[PDB]
Structure formats: C-alpha cells, structure tokens
Amino acid sequence: SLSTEATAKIVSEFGRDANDTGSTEVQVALLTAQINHLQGHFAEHKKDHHSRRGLLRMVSQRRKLLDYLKRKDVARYTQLIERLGLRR
Amino acid sequence: PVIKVRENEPFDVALRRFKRSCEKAGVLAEVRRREFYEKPTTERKRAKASAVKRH
Amino acid sequence: AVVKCKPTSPGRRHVVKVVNPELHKGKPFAPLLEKNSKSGGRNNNGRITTRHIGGGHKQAYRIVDFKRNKDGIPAVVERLEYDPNRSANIALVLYKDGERRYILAPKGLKAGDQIQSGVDAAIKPGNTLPMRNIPVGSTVHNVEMKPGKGGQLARSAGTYVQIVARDGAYVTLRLRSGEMRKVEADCRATLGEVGNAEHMLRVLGKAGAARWRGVRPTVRGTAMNPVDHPHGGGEGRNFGKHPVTPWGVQTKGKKTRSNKRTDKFIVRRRS
C-alpha cells in the first residue's frame, strides 16, 4: 500500500505532533492519498472487482470522517478541504 | 514401475516384485479412476461422505 | 474499425463500413504509379467475354514488389497506404541505400519497423526467406510456385498458408481451401499473415455501392426467353429443367477441372 516514507512525511508534516497518527485530518489525508493512487491502478484493471470493494470502503470512511469534522468544527473543516482540494 | 532381472533371480520373484511395484504405484486403480466423467458436486459429496464415515 | 451508420436515409440504414485510421491521408508516391484503362470485359476482338463488368471509379496501378529479390539490405517501413487495385494495404519502405518499394502489409506491421530479405534473415514477420531455411510448421504468405517467379500464393487480405512437412527437396503446404500442395523447397515466402482482416465484415448497403466497383446487374436465367437461356420461357414461373450455365454445361454439382500435367503435385482435394 502506501510507502512508509509517504505516510511518515504526511504525518510529520500534516499533524499537530511529531507522532500524531490518529487525528481526523491525518486520517482523511491518508485515505485521500490512497484513493488518488488507486485511481491509476483501476484505470487499467476494470475487471478487478475484489479491490473495488476496498476502494468503496475507503471512500465511505472518508465521507463519514468529514461528516464528523463538519459537525464538530466547521472552520478547520473548510481549511482541511481547501488544503486537500476537495468539494465536500 | 520399471523392474529389472538379475542373475540368480528366477522368473516368479521378478514377477512378484513387478506386481508389488504396480500395486504400490496404483497404476490400475488410477486408470480405472479416469474411466468416465464426474461432476464436481459429486466429487465433493463423495469426499465428505467418506470422511464422515471414517469418523 | 467496423462502424454502423445511423439510418437517417433508406440507403444508409444497412451500411457497414470498415475505416482504418492509420492509412496515409495524402497522395501516393509518384515514381511508382502507372496507367490502366477499364476494359468492360472485352478482349482484342471487341466481344464480351466476362459478363457483369463495366464502369466504376478510375484507378491507378501501383507497382508492388512480389519478388523481394534484393538481399542483405535492411529496410524501414515508411507508411501504410490504401491500394484500390487489391484488398490488402501496401506499405512503402525505404532501403538503406535510398530505394523505395511497395510491399504487401502483413498483420501487425506499423510505421517504424524493419524488414530484411535473404538467407540469413531473422525469423520475424515481414521478412522473406526460401522455404528451406524456414522452420517447418510456421505460417507464411506471398508464396511462390516456381523458384524465381514471384509471390503468387496466399496474397489477398487476411489469408495465409502453413508448412506441414518437408519431404527432401520439396515442402507441403495447407492452402486456405484445405487443398494440400507440393512446391519446390527453393521458393521464397514471407513470414506472417496479410493484414486488413476486417475485409469481409463490410456491408455495401445499397444497389449503387456496387456500381462504384464496376459491377453491372445480373439477370436471372428464368427471367429470359427460350432463345437466350436454357432456363428461359414459361407461362408464370416454370422451371422443369436441370440447372445449367447459359451454354448448356450443368452448373450445380459437376466437376470441371482437367489438367493432367500438374495432378502429381496435389496431395489431396479440398472437398
């Protein structure tokens, strides 16, 4: 999956601690990076149905986490989505 | 199932050794297993039936 | 790329057309064209010999190399072009010394490949070799019947032959009709299959789309008079006769081959 270097970079640059690996923003960043990466894999592999399920699970989990962040704090929510370049 | 014949080894001993080799390798049984076709459902059914009879 | 046209007109309702988006779009190479005039199915006496021929679009002849005689000089394919004189496409090549020629396009050949002819040529599509250096069992096209003459077998679009044996000084081929023939082992052949396999997936669609090819209408035998065809005549729709060609020869079932000087090379009939 995601390389150790990429995850280390995103958590050491994007979270509010040296070892912050559990915040909502960090999770959303990891899921969006993995989704963007797997888009390329699924471009050439239409008939891969047993990984489409994992991709759908990641999408749903990202949606629920963003729902929670919107419900709790809206300002940092908008900050996160503008950093990540998303719509909702 | 190759069986040779040596000096001071009579006919019947070599014949019995060849028969034992054939029995061990199960050549005739394996041939008679591929006589016809078997539905995979029947394969799994007979396998489980034998396994539950053994228990 | 077989595409079906939308039925905006009665003549376009049934049309299916094969478009290749790789053919050269401009004009052909100038020093390799000639002139031909349509005959209409008429010989030097002016009489009609073959019926249902006449008219059509004008064409020019392209000098295609069927010998590949020059050897030891690699060549690079320049581009693929459309030839109206046949059913396959032709690919212009540029030899290392500066000479250009037309060859038949094998299957899978594109611009930027390399070809080669001779006795040391590599075994890959596009090359041509005598059938004694070619591995038995392979598939070839543009075969010769006589050593030195030129490519004369399996030359249409999509066709090919297969070498099945080598009985000393000869080879045995399985032709597209199923007939097995013996040819000299010194005849050359070209590796691969001739391209444009989508030729028979084309529907002409209308009556006038066959007159662009120069094909005049066919009149049925029973629709004639007793003085014109053996089948002609009747009050209504009457046949009562064994089917025959317009000249009396039986047309449905009868064999017509008669050639005793080449029957020695026919291993078996197509049947």
Partner: protein, 117 residues
C-alpha cells in the same frame, strides 16, 4: 534375414483385446498377433487364456529372426498382463527387464460421460 539377439516386446492389453508385437531397439516391428486374431471371438476374446495363446503364436511367428533376449512393455488395464509375460518366458525366450508404460494424463481431456447402467 537379420540378427538382433535382443528385441523389445510391446504389450497393449485393454478391456476387450490384447495386442503383442516385437520390435528392435530402434522401434522397427517384426511380427504381431492378437487375442482376437486367434479365433477367440466375443466374450472369450478378452479372457487371459486368449492372451496366452496370442503370445505363444506371435512368438512362434518370429522363429526366423533368432531372438534370445527381450524386454517387455505393458500397457492398458486389460486382463492380459500376467499371462502374456508367462507365455513369453515359457516360449523358450529369456526376458531381462520388465517395465510399465501405461499412459496417465496429468490434469487433460474431458472423458466420455458416465454410462447410465
């Protein structure tokens, strides 16, 4: 005609018939005889006694070659596997090897459907 002194006996015994041939080391055949090619026709055509008779007559048919050594190759699950070997040995011959070459697919091809009897 020719002298070899060591051939190879090929036995092909199936559920209905047994065919016995003798060849050279290079594969070239010399003579043959079958259980059904000996008058045993129908149900008796497969019984091992027919195999023994076929082996004996086939051995007698190769009296002009003068062979003293043999190998045997056994094929098929037919009943003619032991009787043929004994007949070959007891025909005045001498076998120095025994080998089974029955073909066995390693999967291959779908067999005919089961006989509903």
């Amino acid at each position: 005609r020719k002298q070899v002194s060591d051939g190879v006996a090929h036995i092909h015994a199936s559920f209905n018939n047994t065919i016995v041939t003798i060849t050279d080391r290079q594969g070239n055949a010399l003579g043959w005889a079958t259980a059904g090619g000996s008058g045993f026709r129908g149900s008796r055509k497969s019984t091992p006694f027919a195999a023994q008779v076929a082996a004996e007559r086939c051995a007698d048919a190769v009296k002009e070659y003068g062979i003293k050594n043999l190998e045997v190759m056994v094929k098929g699950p037919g009943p003619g596997r032991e009787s043929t070997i004994r007949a070959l040995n007891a025909a005045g011959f001498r076998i120095t090897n025994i080998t089974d070459v029955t073909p066995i697919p390693h999967x291959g091809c779908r067999p005919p459907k089961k006989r509903r009897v």
